[PDB]
Amino acid sequence: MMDSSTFKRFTASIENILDNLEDMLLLGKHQLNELGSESAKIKAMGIMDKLSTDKTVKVLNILEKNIQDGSKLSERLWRDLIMERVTKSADACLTTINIMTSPNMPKAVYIEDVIERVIQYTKFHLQNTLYPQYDPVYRQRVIVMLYNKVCDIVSSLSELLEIQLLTDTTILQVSSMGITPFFVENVSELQLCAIKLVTAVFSRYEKHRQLILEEIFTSLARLPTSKRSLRNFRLPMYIQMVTALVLQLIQCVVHLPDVVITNSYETAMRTAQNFLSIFLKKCGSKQGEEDYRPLFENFVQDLLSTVNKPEWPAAEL
């Protein structure tokens, strides 16, 4: 459809009545929930031919909304608490959908302050809430739906970061979260989304290879080491998650445009050999109070377990 202006005017009416009643301080749950629900696909082609400064003022308004629970630091007040986080999580969903919506996205219809704000919202509220009660070591459907919103928002965050360059003062902490959940238990689909994020940040920028490998080697001891659900990646033949993470780092860097192919490919083997050399030298000696050996054995059986499948190469390398 070239226009399909049959609910484009429906949504456009929604934002113009909203900014009329607010601009001339909260907009409530249900309206913004249905706004995100329709924003899933209706504007995914129809966002074009819309008034730019209205987009700026609405993202400023929802920015000021997400300011309130940005680092919120939080029997009956808990209902207010849960509805506050669900409201701002839906607001986060509207932000991360609204920015990515067009296949071609005009410059400065966004400011990095709101993306920073949704990032820090994600940081604090995720580490405060979802890890402790899905992993007792760090220690009703509202948690589940919040979880699903987290998954969707981080997936959209990944594809949005692949779309356009961001500043390093965003890159450091988005890589931090992209690696963070890989040492708790019931987060597998979050780990797939984190794989998507690290594809975006890793293939997009060549300057953080050292960074990523150092935070990889830092907290390896936090691995669950449990017989239950250790291998949960279908290819029977389920495999462990961080092995496939390593594999997709290996195959992720190509930088496809002459000799660029050759130098980038030898750069790939060099990055891999630095990774495995540092990992091996950390593993080999017996350190105090712990070991990195069992990591190395389970890692390598998974490596040769995925030795020959046409969509997992370089295990031979």
């Binding site: 410059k107 990095e112 302050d113 961001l166």
Partner: protein, 72 residues
């Protein structure tokens, strides 16, 4: 300018018409170099802040001095 050149060529002898056509070809090449300009911003992926509208100066000469000093 192209419109006016075409009009002048149509009313008219030949040397002025071919000069008008060659200068419109130079206009077309100037259009060609003014085509990469909204892509060259696009691959930069620059990050805008709230102070975008306050820096409202159309001189384009002190702007270059500002970019030079920020680079320095």
């Amino acid at each position: 300018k192209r419109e006016t050149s075409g009009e002048k060529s149509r009313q008219l002898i030949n040397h002025d018409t071919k000069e008008l056509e060659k200068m419109t070809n130079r206009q077309g090449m100037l259009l060609k170099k003014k085509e990469e300009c909204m892509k060259k911003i696009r691959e930069l992926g620059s990050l805008p802040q709230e102070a975008f509208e306050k820096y409202q100066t159309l001189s384009l000469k002190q702007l270059f001095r500002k970019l030079e000093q920020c680079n320095t």
